[PDB]
């Protein structure tokens, strides 16, 4: 399996492969080659191991990440339930990252970015679960929220101040059940 990589004037890699299995491996490799230290810290974020390199300031962050996260075995079950081709591509993606790691470890002072030298730690091998963790660490941020608790505190204090009747009216104005005048991306009448 062989893949051609073309870098343009901005350094963007354009991969030309003979199949998707090789394509996705080169995918992970060029991304690792360009952003290894960034990938490592994103994985450490999800795994809650940032404090291993950056110290006790990240302890609470690590604890929160593990609190709400999945075990290595739970992610394996998620992978097993995928279709054959996508699972294999995620695996090839991980092996491509792992490939540049091997390459970088054999020549650290040329192929490891200054951050590794400054903070005195190394990159590590990657498996398919680690690739899922790169997705969990960021995509969850746009879905997760505890605003139900903040609203309960708002309503509780408003009730203590204004009584139940007025507090509910104020709450209805702050956090409405619906605003029918809110601009919407689509309209049923437009079909």
């Amino acid at each position: 399996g062989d893949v051609t990589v073309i870098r343009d004037q901005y350094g963007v890699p354009h991969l030309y492969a003979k199949n998707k299995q090789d394509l996705y491996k080169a995918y992970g490799y060029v991304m690792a080659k360009d952003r290894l230290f960034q990938l490592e810290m994103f994985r450490r974020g999800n795994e809650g191991t940032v404090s291993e390199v950056f110290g006790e300031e990240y302890l609470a962050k690590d604890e929160q990440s593990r609190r709400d996260g999945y075990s290595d075995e739970e992610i394996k079950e998620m992978l097993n339930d995928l279709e054959d081709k996508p699972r294999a591509y995620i695996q090839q993606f991980a092996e491509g990252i792992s490939l540049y790691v091997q390459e970088a470890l054999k020549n650290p002072d040329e192929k490891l970015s200054k951050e590794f030298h400054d903070y005195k730690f190394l990159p590590r091998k990657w498996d398919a679960t680690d690739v899922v963790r790169l997705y969990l660490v960021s995509m969850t941020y746009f879905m997760d929220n505890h605003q139900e608790l903040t609203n309960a505190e708002i309503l509780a204090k408003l009730e203590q101040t204004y009584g139940e009747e007025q507090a509910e009216k104020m709450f209805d104005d702050l956090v409405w059940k619906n605003d029918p005048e809110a601009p919407a991306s689509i309209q049923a009448e437009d079909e």
């Binding site: 073309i6 354009h14 991969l15 492969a17 394509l23 995918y27 952003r35 993606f93 690739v131």
Partner: peptide, 23 residues
């Protein structure tokens, strides 16, 4: 936060960016 790439294999050509780490 983004990673731009070109992907080209038989029956699949795509160019653009995704969030870092996404395949």
């Amino acid at each position: 936060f983004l990673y731009e790439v070109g992907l080209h294999a038989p029956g699949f050509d795509m160019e653009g960016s995704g969030f870092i780490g996404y395949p």
